[model samples]
Target: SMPFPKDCSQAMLNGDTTSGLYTIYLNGDKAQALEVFCDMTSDGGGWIVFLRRKNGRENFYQNWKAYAAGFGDRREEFWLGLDNLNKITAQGQYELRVDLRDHGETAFAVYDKFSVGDAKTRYKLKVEGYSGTAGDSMAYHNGRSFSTFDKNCALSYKGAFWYRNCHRVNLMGRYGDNNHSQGVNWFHWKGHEHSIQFAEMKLRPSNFRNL
Candidate 1:
């Protein structure tokens, strides 16, 4: 079993009591994947996970709030798993950052681990495509509402089809949506100001052979 970093854990328990960014550097034997776990008990405060490659490419980013809105049950405990999503290969030294915001009177903890094989089998949602129907109109009202317009889209993953009538919105005015008719990834969302929360995230090698 992978253990949580002791220093990181202590920092979460006794660090500054306001919104801020914490940095953690992970370096050691190269692993094929990384796992993150955390507990976020506040609905107003959430975290953003960023990974910077050794080549100075900060390619991987995940907003736990948006993720929970899209896939999770809007709870305190959650898990996120990624597999080569950011073209990570032969990990040497990677930079990880956790952006904590507006976590007033709330508790949080984040931990990570590295492994060398495909992650455990489970159903996961990978973005396929996106679009903006209103030419950058409001797509999502808040963390819990659908797009302003019922944009028709579909996504296909792991030989299955997931369809929805709403797009997504962000804090910026970038309007976009996602779908999956063929194997595709990446989408966009409109701009808006909102808050969300999360608990855990993990990354592992792609075990497509079993899926």
Candidate 2:
């Protein structure tokens, strides 16, 4: 009676090679189990970490109910909520990798069709297919909705996300503040005020095999 693996690429093909926190089981039930943060290794290993920012001590200018039931600490910084990212992209195609860095470089940003559109579309962002090298800047907020100026005049950077008007890459700003309106910015690799300390926003399950 141990059938609870629906993410981290099926818990690394049912082996789970020592990553970091894990406990998934989305559409496979178990009351929609979730407790993410897994990487296993890197691009080859199954990743499912929702979002992570480095050192700045977790303060993504959050709102919209703390980014829809999410906040810091899954060993450091976190964001894995938004109804568990619509139950892990509604159990099908998902692939978004965003590993960034600054203080002189490192980058990544792949997105072969990511998804998110729930909570009445406030979690609306459907990132398209783009290759890596930390650019694209969230595809012009693809279908934008999620905002947090407490859910209204979304301009000034109290930071939630998905705002077509606010970010070119708002990693939910306000950590160690650099301010492209409020920093954590990733405007095509350290452009908008240079707030790229480090970022991570993993995902998986889009042809998740073949090394």
Candidate 3:
């Protein structure tokens, strides 16, 4: 197992304090993988993680859920694809910007490196130990639109009016009926705060090869 980075684990959260953009400099031609580990102490707030170029061009954005439990109980990890984000061309330097806001307290870390195997090798992102629910009107719809959650690999819900539950497990593996395009999107009705700890983002080689 890889050891957690010190900077991320030591990061402290004061109420309503926003993290100034932090930099993770890449040392190779391109980045192969990116991982984030977060330990949450409060809920009612969430964080946004994004990739950007050195010149401040934004490439990708994903929201992360924070847990409400105190001490060592609520921890999550997120795995992101550098290739999928299209932000690593020749990789002179890149930036990861994070904004933590509202009523939650959290500590987070980042991991990244160059490719160890085939750059085109497919991988899947999966989540575990999440907690939340949705209002009655918001039924879990099989993912049809680009923003809806694909139940095969994600956990979320959506409809014609608003695409509220937008959490997705991007670039997943194929398992039985599950394929690369499928994802999980769990739903939570409007106004109510939803809190979930991802615990970990597990990545493995997909049974189906990328063509």
Candidate 4:
């Protein structure tokens, strides 16, 4: 699970131009393919690639978050696996490439490509794009407090599960001493769970509410 952006404002602050493309290559012999490579390029922005068992499936094993922090920050490109929770299902190599570019306008473009079975096989192709503001607008609102968002009273139970409770001190204090209540309640990224704590997921209903 991941934390929803702090708010619409936070999302806007973290927004970027994005584009993607997907291609699938089928094989006539149905033999396993190897040395798979995903080729792609973006105009320059933020991008990611993700792999799932079935098309349009919700759960994914490996997803990459590619982002460039302007000209100063180190350009980041890396792949993240979901705790190696599940093995890759495809027998043949599957590849994905994501491209994110900023055109200076409010619009952003995402390009993606996919290949399966064999690299040279007649593959399927898919493309998708979206245009919008770079980030969340509500985060810019004045006087927005994240105090109620803190997870002080919550309970960390059953090893992997966390149950909400009414503890006075920030529950995060248990992991480590609480230096400051404000900083302790932000979010904890513990590998499998991208975002941990109430403050981080307060705005994302799909992340922690169902639990």
Best by TM-score: 2
lDDT of every predicted structure (CA atoms): 0.24, 0.79, 0.22, 0.20
TM-score of 3: 0.24
Tens-digit lDDT track for model 2 on 1-211?
2378878878777876887998888887988788888887877878888888888777777667878888888777889778788778988998888888777678898888898988988888898888877778888888887787777424476667887766778776777677555778877777777776778888897788564
Q: What is the lDDT of residue 48 in candidate 3?
A: 23
Per-residue lDDT value at 167 in model 2:
75
Better of 3 and 4 by TM-score: 3
Give me the displacement of residue 115 in model 4, in angstroms.
5.1
| lDDT at residue 101 of model 4 (Cα atoms) | 22
lDDT of 4 by residue, 1-211 (tens): 1123221111222442222321212231223211111222222211123221111112111112110001111111221221110112121222222221212212222212122211122111222221222222111211211112221222232110111232212212222223332112212112222211211000111111122
lDDT of 3 by residue, 144-167 (tens): 222213211123221111132433
Q: Candidate 3 — what's its lDDT?
A: 0.22
Q: Write the per-residue lDDT of candidate 1 for residues 1-211, one digit (tens) a residue.
A: 1222211232244433333343222332134223333222222222222221111111112232332222212122222223332222123212122222122322222222222222232112232122222222221211122111111222212111122333331211111212231211112211223222211232222221131
* Candidate ranking (lDDT, best to worst): 2, 1, 3, 4
Which model is ahead, 3 or 4, in terms of lDDT?
Answer: 3
TM-score of 4: 0.16
Q: Residue 19 CA error for candidate 1 (Å)?
A: 1.7
Q: Which regions of candidate 2 are displaced past 4 Å?
A: 6-10, 15-23, 26-29, 33-46, 52-78, 82-99, 107-171, 174-177, 185-193, 201-211
Better of 1 and 3 by TM-score: 3
